[PDB]
Nucleic acid binder design. Structure first.
Ligand code: MN
Ligand code: MN
Ligand code: MN
Lengths: 157, 158
DNA sequence: TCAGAACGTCGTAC
DNA sequence: TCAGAACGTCGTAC
DNA sequence: GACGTTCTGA
DNA sequence: GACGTTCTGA
């Protein structure tokens, strides 16, 4: 479709401006390795224009829409399966966050093998590099925290 | 052609998200009617990605790029001639600010006749309606201020 | 007299 | 054990 | 925008 | 994001 491509180009613009493509290290207490590398695309817009997020969901065919308790609404695609598809669709039109996407795509390749501490460690190191591209200030959970935990768990990386 | 349409669709997204399509009432002390109705599209981005605003300028073929003194940069197209061409390219793809664009396009029609006080008043009333679509809290120059000034100046309007 | 170029900063929607 | 769905809020880039 | 956290269930 | 103001020149 030249029509679907018109949609994605518009969405890339929106994402480039009011979106977030991210990899984070999230604490998971019942993981044997204690950490997940979570990947996501998020789109933010005031709840006053909530509908646009649903329109984005319709365009992509996946993802969730929620309302935050502060007047904001969010669209999120989280997880390797749905996200890889989403990013491949936007990849040709992204101008500001293409690096974030290329990196996340590198992480998604490793995700099915994150039970191996070495692979997890690589995913985590890649997450850190995505953090360096975002506006974020509160990034506390880092690759070093994974490496110190893994070592404490008796693993070798 | 289609490549251009992809560029415009993307720009519309970027405008829908981090842009501003607006109409304002600006005081002009040396105007006969004391006021102008200024129409504009603006794109905002941190100076860290200053390059993208230059990219937009290249895409549209007009408009200015400046750096503000707070780490922000802006791309701006101000004025009827450049703006109308600009809005018409984005208009099919705008999804959040199409109303602002359509209203500004109504205002652009009137601008070559804003020497007439009643036409200025129409554009000023229309600008007021664009201000209702924006997120601004700071707008203090409204249609009512033009109406009172024009009356003071000896003109007849309503 | 016009009016864009360029500017400086508040409030909140990212 | 996994990990998305849904959530709550800080700092600033709109 | 971009984090960290809690809920839910495969 | 979206204002109101100052510089510049047609
Ligand atoms: Mn932005
Ligand atoms: Mn926005
Ligand atoms: Mn924004």
């Amino acid at each position: 479709n030249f029509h679907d491509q018109l949609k994605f180009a518009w969405l890339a613009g929106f994402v480039d401006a009011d979106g977030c493509i991210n990899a984070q290290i999230v604490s998971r207490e019942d993981y044997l390795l204690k950490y997940q590398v979570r990947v996501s695309l998020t789109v933010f817009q005031s709840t006053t224009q909530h509908f646009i997020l649903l329109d984005i969901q319709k365009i992509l065919g996946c993802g969730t829409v929620r309302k935050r308790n502060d007047g904001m609404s969010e669209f999120c695609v989280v997880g390797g399966t749905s996200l890889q598809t989403t990013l491949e669709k936007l990849l040709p039109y992204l101008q500001l966050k293409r690096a974030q996407a290329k990196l996340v795509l590198q992480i998604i390749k490793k995700l099915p093998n994150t039970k191996d501490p070495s692979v997890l460690m690589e995913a985590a190191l890649l997450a850190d590099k995505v953090g360096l591209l975002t506006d974020g200030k509160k990034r506390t959970i880092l690759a070093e925290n994974v490496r110190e935990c893994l070592k404490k768990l008796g693993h070798v990386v």
